[PDB]
Structures are given as C-alpha cells and as structure tokens.
Paper text:
In about 60-70% of newly synthesized proteins, the initiator methionine is removed by a metalloenzyme called methionine aminopeptidase (MetAPs). Type Ia MetAP is the isoform with minimum sequence and structure required for the catalysis and is present in all prokaryotes. MetAPs have strict substrate specificity towards peptides with methionine on the amino-terminus. Here, we report the discovery of a novel MetAP1a found predominantly in the streptococci bacteria with two new structural motifs one of which may undergo posttranslational modification of glycosylation and phosphorylation.
To further understand the relationship of the two inserts with respect to catalytic domain, crystal structure of the SpMetAP1a is determined at 3.2 Å in the P65 space group with two molecules in the asymmetric unit. The overall structure is similar to that of the E. coli MetAP1a (EcMetAP1a) adopting the pita-bread fold. Since the crystals were grown in the absence of metal salts, the active site is devoid of any metal ions. Although the overall structure of SpMetAP1a is similar to other MetAP structures in the catalytic domain, there is important difference near the active site. In the new conformation, the metal binding H199 moves away from the active site when compared to analogous residue (H171) in EcMetAP1a. Hence, substrate cannot bind to the enzyme in this conformation. The tyrosine kinase phosphorylation motif (124KKYT) is also well ordered and structurally placed closed to the glycosylation motif.
Author numbering:
A (entry chain B): 1 to 198, 208 to 286
B (entry chain A): 1 to 286
C-alpha cells in the first residue's frame, strides 16, 4: 500500500527493524560449515518467543499450501522463498535468510498474545490478522570461505541494492531506482530477476525517470535478486514456493526498508554501518 | 495509491471512462489510410473542450521534457509513449492510441473550471491535481487492411488482456492475472514487455494502480472487493527489450524492430467478478 505512514507507524517499524536486524547479527555466529540449516529457523523461532514477536510468514497462502516456516532459506541457485530444512551447510555454500517479523506486542485477552509454546509448528492465523508493525528483510551469507564467484556476486547485489537506495531521494521517481539497480548489476554480466516483480516494494529494474514520484513518509523495501548470467526463474512444481534459477547460476539477494525523508532515505532494518556487512 | 475506494468514487471513473470510450469509437472512422496522424490529437483536443475534460498527459513531469500531448500515438514498432505528429497513415500501419482524461468538470472562477481555451500548447498544470476522476486506456487500431502478422498481434494482445481480466476475481492474487496474461501471449512465441511498469505508471498518469502482464500465480496482493485496477499488455513479435528515445526521453520502441501492440482497460473488483469501467461495446467485439 502506497499511502503514507504517520510517525508512530514509522517508529513502530524501526523497532521491529531493530529486532530483525539483531537476528541477522545472531546469524553470523551461526551460519557456518557443518551446521544444520534448520538451526536458522529455530533461532528465529526461539527469539520470537523470547521477545514476543510474530513470524508473519507462517500461515500465508499458496496455490498448493500455506507457508509453513517463519523463515525462507534460499540456498545457492535457489533465488527466493525456499524452505529451511534438515541440511548440513557446506563451506562454499551461499545461503539467504528472508523473514518478516511482527511486534513487539504485549499480552492480554483474546487480542494481545503471550504467544509462547502455542504450536509454531501448526497453522494458526493470529498472523494474517496483522501484528501492528513488522519488517521483511533478507540478508545473504557465505558459509565458510566463498569462491570469487560468490564474493563478487555478493558485492554487486549489495552495492546494487545500496545504489538503489542512493536514488531514494525525495522529489524523484521509483523509475530512478530500478534503473540504477538495473544498470549496476547488468553492467557486469549479472542478470537481474524480473518474474517476481517486487506492503509496497520497489522493482530492481525500470526505465529511469519513469515511475511513481516519491514523497516524504513512504516506506519502501529494496530486494535485489541477481544471477550469474541469466535471469529466468522456476517455481517449484510440487510446493509452488521455492524458486531456483533456470541456467543453474547462483542468485543473491539483499533487502532493507527505508523512509523517504528530506535529508535523504533512512533505514530501519540496519545492522549497523552500511556496506560493512 | 494501491488502496480501496469510495462507491461514488468508482462511479466517477465509469462516467469518466464513458467519455474516453466514446472518443475511441469516434476514432474508428477517423483512423484511415491517407489521414494525417496529427488529427488524432486535434480530435481528442477538440472533444476535450466540448465537454470539460482535461487531457492530463500534458504537463506530466519528465526528464528531457514534460509530456506535451493529449495522446500517445504509438506506431508499429513503437511500443509506448510516442507523440502524435504529422504522419500520413499508410494502409497496414498498426497504431496504438493512449489517453488520460479527467472529469467531467463544471465551470467558473473559484468553484470548478472552464476549459475552452487554455491554449493546450502551454505549461498547463491544473492537470497535476486530482482532476475529479478519470481514465487511462490505450487502444489499438489497424489502418486500412492489416497484414496477417498484424491481425494476430492485435488479436493475441486483445485476448490475453481479457484472459487477464477473467482472473481479477475477489480472492485471487495479482500474480494469477499477470501469469495468465504472460502465458497466453508467450505460447505463440510473442514477447511480453517487462522493462516498464512505471511501477504504478505515474508516467503519463497520476498515482493509479497497475497490474503487470507477467508473474507467478502467487506473488502479489490478494485482491479484495472495491479495488480498481488498469491492465495493459505491451506485446511484441519477438523481442521484449525496448528503446527509450534519447532526444526527448519518452518513446519506447522494440529493440529488434519487431511490431508491438497494446490494449488497455480498467475495472472494479466486484463480487460478480470484475466489472470493466472503460468499455466501448461488448467485449471481444471491437
């Protein structure tokens, strides 16, 4: 939804962005060679129960089925929306952890959840009835030590993302972002995903000076999906969720949420110093 | 903005779409071989004056320059946002006419405006101010008798769009629409454009939502009753890649020199299904 947010709904979000940010920070100490990808789900699982946040990915619809996990764990050639699973990570692996968390909410009647060991394992929609403030935010991680293949892939996806941001300046068109993102990644061989066309969201591609003019108070998210070479994407036939690349290439993806603001864009989902993680 | 609406707010658009449709029908007679394309503008200009309807595309902001015309007269291998101009229409040319018009609007000083002469050649930005309700809708035209290559191009886009509409039923997602649009055209090795959704087409516009003509059958807003959306497939023979004019910064053109075509409607998400707000007949027939 495009219509602007009042400063409290903004504040709301930075605090969920605070939280989100911290899971990502806990994750560094955990995404390593030999560990069961599944520890990722459990960590967010665990940390949601401790500080009373909702994993709002649990219960969302699908042609096939609703989304079972709190987390999406897209590994390597998996682009996005893959599941977390029993899998021992490897040195060299590239792993992406998207999630959307809502809170922090207190506790009370059949309205305000205590939210502990209700069965995160099962198909309850307190979730689709929204938890006030939230944040999607995917962040990528090289498990162990990465090929140059990877290191490079990741840097571009990253700077690409932050270059989009750079253009998120008041009095300017969304066109000017996707444009920017497009150019950067695309001017190095890397192909950008289009088939997912990314609460509102900006696409990673477009003709510059050719979109919605940006206002103060809009909160947007930038979610670059870049591939080695080629950009076409599958949709898991069996679950209608996971997306792998088509040419076998790798895909990376970084993602924040910001506010348009005289003085320029301001990030809510920041894990500290930008470009240093 | 991608929210819901009012009930009379819906109304305004149908009434504002009643008018744009009428133009489009008017044009059927107009668009013959031997006719100067510029007529399409002057005509539209003309009818915009006779009822108070502002042509909102004039003054919409842009880089190299603001859009200066009531219409876009895209032509053959031009896919979108090309100017009307003096071109004398060869038999077999494929011409796509896009417009945005707001109103109708009553008259006078500080209570609703008069519109005979603003000089429609000026820096006339009343246009950039919610000018009541309105309607965007491109439509495609064959000048004279159209090749087989063209006949199909026009027919496949026309249908693909209506196939999109079919999906716009309360409780589907936007994905479902764009997917099925994508599929239909792509199944005859037609190309579908992606490089521009102006995501929300605030280009040649102000604010209104835009479903994209490609996607996955999940990845978008589940669509509730009361949403009003436009839909507009640019299709190409062959390549979906697109120019953008360097001199003026508007006109988009197929990369390989193929032909492109575009149709467009808007509609409300009612609970009978979707009710098309910009109709100029019974559907499939025009």
């Amino acid at each position: 939804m495009i219509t602007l947010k009042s400063a409290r709904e903004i504040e709301a979000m930075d605090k969920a962005g605070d939280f989100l940010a911290s899971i990502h920070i806990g994750l560094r100490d955990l995404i390593k060679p030999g560990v069961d990808m599944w520890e990722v789900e459990e960590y967010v699982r665990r940390r949601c129960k401790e500080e009373n946040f909702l994993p709002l990915q649990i219960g969302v619809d699908g042609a096939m089925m609703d989304y079972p996990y709190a987390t999406c764990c897209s590994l390597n050639d998996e682009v996005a929306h893959a599941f977390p699973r029993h899998y021992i990570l490897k040195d060299g692996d590239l792993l992406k952890v998207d999630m959307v968390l809502g809170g922090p909410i207190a506790k009370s009647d059949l309205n305000v959840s205590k939210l502990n060991f209700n069965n995160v394992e099962q198909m309850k929609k307190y979730t689709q009835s929204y938890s006030g403030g939230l944040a999607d935010s995917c962040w990528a991680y090289a498990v162990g030590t990465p090929s140059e293949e990877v290191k490079n892939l990741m840097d571009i996806t990253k700077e690409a993302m932050y270059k989009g941001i750079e253009q998120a300046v008041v009095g300017n068109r969304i066109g000017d972002i996707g444009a920017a993102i497009q150019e950067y990644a695309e001017s190095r061989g890397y192909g950008v995903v289009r088939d997912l066309v990314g609460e509102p969201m900006v696409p990673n591609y477009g003709i510059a000076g050719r979109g919605l003019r940006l206002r103060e108070g809009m909160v947007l998210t930038i979610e670059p999906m870049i591939n080695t070479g080629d950009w076409e994407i599958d949709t898991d036939m069996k679950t209608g969720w996971a997306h792998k690349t088509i040419d076998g290439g790798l895909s990376c993806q970084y993602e924040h949420q910001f506010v348009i603001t005289k003085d320029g864009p301001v990030i809510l989902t920041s894990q500290g110093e930008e470009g240093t993680y």
